[PDB]
Curated annotation (Swiss-Prot):
Organism phylogeny: Eukaryota, Metazoa, Spiralia, Lophotrochozoa, Mollusca
Segment of the intact protein contained: 50 to 65 of 66
UniProt-reported outcome of changing H12A: In non-hydroxylated and non-gamma-carboxylated analog; 10-fold decrease in potency of inhibition of rat alpha-9-alpha-10/CHRNA9-CHRNA10 nAChR. Decrease in potency of inhibition of HVA calcium channels in rat/mouse DRG neurons
Protein name in UniProt: Alpha-conotoxin Vc1a
Tissue expression notes: Expressed by the venom duct.
Stretches for region Ser-Xaa-Pro motif, crucial for potent interaction with nAChR: 4-6
């Protein structure tokens, strides 16, 4: 997922 994307990452999605 956004693990390698700082854009999709919300204010607090998940610690990868």
């Amino acid at each position: 997922g956004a693990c390698s994307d700082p854009r999709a990452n919300y204010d607090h999605p998940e610690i990868c």
